[PDB]
């Protein structure tokens, strides 16, 4: 992982990239159907645990130092670039796997992330990875109103309310992660004080109007509150949240030959 | 025709192997295939937006502008 994150990012013999390894790791985590046959002549969970502990200890090892010359002046730019590369890689490699194996870490790992966020409450990748873990936990349905579970509940509600009151003062590429996290909370904890989340989701969809991924994740989160909450407190802010949804509603080789079409052997906004 | 160096050095295959060149050709075809893949992945988004009026810069607005500047948008 150090070698993978060590590769820099440049945007507008061949130099390789970092995105190629995603299928490798997906196979590593989902090759049970053939490692059983190899065993003939569980452990995937064990390597998952090893990966989790390695990535957490390594990210907590890395320094996060910036300078004054508002002005964002990182003091260790190479380390920060490695950090953003690894955080993007981890947020894209977790979705295809199930956090049933991640279940032991849902308290301690998240606690460490909360500590790191409290250290530097200006890291977008922090909120990216927090959103990843929280959607994993809601996917595995970890929230059920265990002292560890109650501690997770309290941690999550505290972090959510503080980042909700702080995101109003953040800037682009940063508050976007915050609102992505906010919409990515499970409904039960954010059953309380919708007054904070309403402007958050309003500006979330406002940004989604020019940047789709925010828009559909807000859609999913929205339909989630619609399904999973009582309507009593649902009514009051509908007259506020629905009018903003007026956006998005202003819109306006091969031949007769038979060769089995090997071109076809392989595999937005309207959505 | 001042570029005859390229045409004279273009096909000095003689000190090379045939099927090695074939493997090179098909490998190049493969890299072109994934280059097309990433190109169409990039093209998935909307086409680049083009303006229809040249904009000057100053501290005071410039009313003296052609009628095209308003009719074309």
């Amino acid at each position: 992982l150090i070698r993978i994150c060590s590769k820099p990012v440049v945007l507008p013999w061949k130099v390789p990239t970092y995105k190629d390894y995603v299928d490798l790791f997906r196979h590593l985590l989902s090759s049970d159907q053939m490692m059983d046959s190899i065993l003939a002549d569980s452990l995937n969970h064990l390597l998952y645990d090893e990966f989790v502990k390695s990535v957490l200890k390594i990210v907590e090892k890395l320094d996060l130092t910036l300078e004054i010359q508002a002005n964002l002046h990182p003091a260790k730019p190479k380390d920060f670039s490695a950090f953003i590369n690894l955080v993007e890689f981890c947020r894209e490699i977790l979705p295809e796997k199930q956090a049933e194996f991640f279940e032991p870490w849902v308290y301690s790992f998240s606690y460490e992330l909360i500590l790191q966020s409290t250290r530097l409450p200006l890291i977008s990748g922090f909120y990216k990875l927090l959103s990843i873990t929280v959607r994993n936990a809601k996917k595995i349905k970890y929230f059920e109103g265990d002292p560890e579970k109650y501690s997770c509940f309290a941690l999550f509600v505290k972090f959510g309310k503080e980042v909700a009151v702080k995101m109003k003062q953040y800037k682009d590429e940063l508050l976007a992660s915050c609102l992505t996290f906010l919409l990515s909370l499970p409904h039960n904890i954010i059953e309380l004080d919708v007054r904070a989340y309403v402007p958050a989701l309003q500006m979330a969809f406002k940004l989604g109007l020019s940047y789709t991924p925010l828009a559909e994740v807000g859609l999913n989160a929205l339909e989630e509150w619609s399904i999973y909450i009582d309507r009593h407190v649902m009514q009051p802010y509908y007259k506020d949240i629905l009018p903003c949804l007026d956006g998005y509603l202003k819109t306006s080789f091969n031949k007769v030959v038979l060769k089995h079409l090997k071109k076809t052997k392989n595999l937005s906004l309207e959505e | 025709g001042r570029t005859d160096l390229l045409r004279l050095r273009r096909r000095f295959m003689r000190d090379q192997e045939k099927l090695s060149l074939m493997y090179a050709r098909k490998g190049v075809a493969e890299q072109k295939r994934e280059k097309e893949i990433k190109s169409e992945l990039k093209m998935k988004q909307d086409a680049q937006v083009v303006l229809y009026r040249s904009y000057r810069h100053g501290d005071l607005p410039d009313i003296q502008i052609k009628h095209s500047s308003l009719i074309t948008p």
């Binding site: 091969n254 007769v256 038979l258 089995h260 079409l261 076809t264 | -």
Partner: protein, 113 residues
């Protein structure tokens, strides 16, 4: 799209003999194949029921010894091959009737040919 008109014409293109009708049939089938060869997300859905009605038509009408129908038979078998290869496993409702039609085709009077 135009495939409705085309299926109507093909169902209307086997009234008389005049094996030039079969030539119109094969050319037509070429056009519907290439039209539905590369749908985006939508035309496949209509193409499925178009295949349903066309298999119905060739089972109930294109059931004779005329070679103008035989060439249609081979070309549409190849055509359905490439569609189902492209469409994957999404033609589950039509599978058993396709099997019935195909078994009938084997037991068809073409068994002498």
């Amino acid at each position: 799209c135009s495939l409705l008109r085309l299926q109507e014409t093909l169902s209307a293109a086997d009234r008389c003999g005049a094996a030039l009708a079969g030539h119109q049939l094969i050319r037509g089938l070429g056009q519907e194949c290439v039209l539905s060869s590369s749908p985006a997300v939508l035309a496949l859905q209509t193409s499925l029921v178009f295949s349903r009605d066309f298999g119905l038509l060739v089972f109930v009408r294109k059931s004779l010894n005329s070679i103008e129908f035989r060439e249609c038979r081979e070309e549409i078998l190849k055509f359905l091959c490439i569609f189902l290869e492209k469409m994957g496993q999404k033609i589950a409702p039509y599978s058993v009737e396709i099997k019935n039609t195909c078994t009938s085709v084997y037991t068809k009077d073409r068994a002498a040919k």
